[PDB]
Design a protein around this nucleic acid. Structure first.
Lengths: 484, 168
DNA sequence: GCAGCTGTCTAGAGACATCGAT
DNA sequence: CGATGTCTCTAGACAGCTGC
């Protein structure tokens, strides 16, 4: 049986996918019920995953996770032969390392030796100046922080704080994923969260330019080494999301809110006259200055989008903040609709829509549910003037189309709660109705309908086991509801 | 001796030799104690200057350098940003010995101005034996964190062009 | 009176037949 | 073994056929 499975994974590389499924099934069954050979099975699967990256090899990690969640003691019975696997930081650590650490999480926690090996291997990996090695290091950091839980050994907590702070000085590409992954570990700490906010605040002071509502605080000149050094938009998005988490959880926090508020009040007062990119054609592809304008142009778009989330969330049916949102998108559209996609890149017809957005699936769900299918006395007549901005309407849904497309092509999305399948499932369960309500209220409806096509496509292709609740959530036999 | 007294009130003990570091195993209280000591007694150019003189007098001993085997506590203040650099320079002509500071600078990127420090490290590399030069050449990626890629690539290509025997 | 409106021409992108030996 | 060219096409454009 075990030889047949080994050569099954060998012969894989859709009938090939079915062969993978059969091999995983037989290997799991022969591992679960056969005691003295389970160590041999673990050795075989450990020897088979290595030197295998050209073919889709996600099967190795997934069946390994299944067999270790069924029986975690096998690795210790095998004297923890996973230490040698730490060299995989150079072959293909784009997703394999993340899944492998996910699988081995309980055995790293229970076993101190493997934890020590992991921390030392990642410590020597982080300061390797290779892009791939640094990507592997930051990927491992994204998991090790949440490997240990204290939210509900303090030296272990405080010692890990400075590693990512030191790694922050590296390139923008490796500065990227930490902004996204900070929230996941911030959902798992109380005072480590305070230290993380302080570090992020010190980071954002680098480009704040505290000047009290004057010429715009654009220190993008530092992110030029034609090249880019820090993704300001991702940092701002992480700042907003972590601030929201801290506010919901319960000195600098009051300063943190006011400087964020000051920035919002500064963007509304800093238009495309104080900006350096006031020319309609300063952009030039394959030029040393044009691409510098292009990266400045794309970066500020993410800057505007983040504060749209802030003002909408920090204000609660308060007309003063709603007009701020209007001004932010006014700056956004005035600089995104034209200049870019006129001189930036529109020579080929844009198949996609408004550029990669840095919003929250939770936020866009709240926005659409509050915008459409919501009419109460708590509404302060702000949506009435907000509804006049039909350009904001098109963007308000096109971002959602971008997010679920990420769930279409890939298995995840951006923003908080991008990896908890039930979480977007509830989000998808909620946004679909108002998406349908907007279509049935009576282009703009063309956008929401296109989304529904991609919810149903994603529902069947990804959440196949979760179809009955989604079908019933539109208000058990699926056909009667489907026929409806 | 001013730095020695500051260590006495908050820091290591006055012991020059080959023993262990007399520092508390923590970085939230002992480090804060050292910071408050360095921010309470030194508050003027003269007192910080005499503190720097005392630090130079104390750490100059090779016994203290062997005791070092951390230095991140010193780097927590901006006034020691070039002090650690010049102490590294003083510790580098000790071999095969600079291996300690080579490994100590690993997992450490506190620096004053990396752009000039790179030029200075090849300047001292022009007068170094072969093995230490090999280790330092390996250590050019160590001192950087991928923020000076163009110039460092240019200079390493120059080193490759000049040195063929030491290409490895 | 030269101001209006009316359409094949051209570039987009995606699927297929053989494309041309490994 | 399979990179490649050929072809249904959908639209947009500015330019010929309406006009003016």
């Amino acid at each position: 049986l075990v030889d047949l499975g080994f050569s099954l994974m060998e012969s894989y590389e859709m009938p090939a996918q079915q062969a993978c499924k059969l091999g995983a099934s037989i290997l799991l069954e022969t591992f679960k019920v056969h005691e003295p050979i389970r160590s041999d099975i673990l050795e075989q699967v450990l020897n088979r995953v290595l030197t295998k990256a050209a073919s889709p090899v996600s099967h190795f990690i997934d069946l390994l996770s299944n067999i270790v969640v069924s029986a975690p003691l096998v690795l210790q019975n095998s004297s923890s032969r996973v230490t040698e696997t730490f060299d995989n930081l150079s072959f293909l650590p784009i997703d394999t390392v993340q899944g492998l650490l996910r699988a081995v999480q309980p055995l790293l926690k229970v076993s101190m030796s493997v934890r020590d090996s992991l921390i030392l291997v990642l410590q020597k990996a982080i300061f390797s100046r290779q892009l791939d090695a640094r990507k592997a290091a930051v990927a491992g950091f994204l998991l090790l922080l949440r490997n240990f839980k204290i939210l509900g050994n303090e030296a272990f907590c405080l010692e890990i704080l400075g590693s990512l702070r030191r790694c922050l000085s590296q390139q923008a590409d490796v500065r990227l994923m930490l902004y996204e992954g900070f929230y996941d570990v911030l959902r798992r700490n109380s005072q480590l969260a305070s230290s993380i906010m302080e570090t992020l605040l010190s980071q954002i002071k680098q480009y704040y330019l505290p000047q009290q509502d004057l010429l715009p605080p654009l220190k993008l000149e530092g992110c030029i080494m034609i090249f880019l050094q820090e993704p300001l938009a991702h940092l701002l998005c992480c700042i907003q999301h972590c601030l929201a988490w801290y506010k919901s959880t319960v000195g600098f926090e009051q300063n943190f809110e006011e400087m964020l508020e000051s920035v919002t009040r500064r963007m509304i007062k800093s238009e495309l006259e104080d900006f350096e990119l006031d020319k309609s054609a300063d952009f030039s592809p394959s030029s040393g200055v044009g691409v510098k304008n292009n990266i400045y142009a794309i970066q500020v778009m993410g800057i505007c989008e983040v504060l749209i989330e802030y003002n909408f969330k920090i204000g609660n049916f308060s007309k003063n903040k709603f007009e701020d949102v209007l001004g932010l998108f006014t700056c956004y559209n005035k600089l995104s609709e034209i200049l870019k996609e006129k001189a930036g890149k529109n020579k080929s017809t844009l198949g996609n829509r408004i550029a990669r957005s840095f919003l929250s699936m939770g936020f866009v769900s709240t926005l659409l549910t509050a915008l459409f299918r919501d009419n109460a006395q708590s509404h302060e007549e702000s949506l009435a003037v907000l509804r006049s901005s039909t350009e904001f309407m098109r963007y308000a849904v096109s971002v959602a189309l971008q997010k679920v497309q990420q769930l279409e092509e890939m298995g995840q999305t951006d923003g908080p709660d991008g990896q908890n399948p039930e979480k977007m499932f509830q989000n998808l369960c909620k946004i679909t109705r108002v998406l349908l309500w907007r279509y049935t209220s009576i282009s703009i409806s063309l956008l929401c309908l296109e989304g529904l096509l991609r919810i149903f496509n994603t529902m069947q292709q990804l959440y196949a086991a979760r179809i009955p609740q989604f079908l019933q959530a539109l208000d058990i036999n699926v056909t009667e509801k489907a026929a409806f | 001796g001013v730095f020695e007294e500051l260590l006495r009130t908050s820091g290591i003990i006055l012991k020059v030799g080959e023993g262990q570091n007399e520092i508390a195993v923590d970085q939230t209280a002992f480090q804060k104690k050292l910071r408050v000591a360095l921010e309470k007694h030194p508050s003027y150019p003269g007192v910080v200057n005499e503190f720097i003189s005392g630090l130079e007098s104390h750490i100059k001993d090779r016994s203290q350098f062997k005791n070092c085997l951390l230095i991140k506590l010193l780097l927590g203040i901006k006034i020691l940003q070039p002090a650690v650099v010049t102490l590294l320079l003083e510790k580098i002509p000790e071999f095969n010995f600079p291996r300690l500071i080579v490994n100590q600078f690993k997992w450490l990127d506190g620096l004053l101005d990396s752009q000039d420090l790179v030029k200075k490290l090849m300047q001292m590399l022009s007068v170094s034996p072969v093995p230490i030069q090999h280790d330092i050449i390996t250590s050019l990626p160590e001192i950087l964190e991928d923020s000076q890629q163009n110039e460092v690539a240019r200079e390493l290509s120059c080193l490759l062009k000049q040195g063929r025997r030491l290409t490895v």
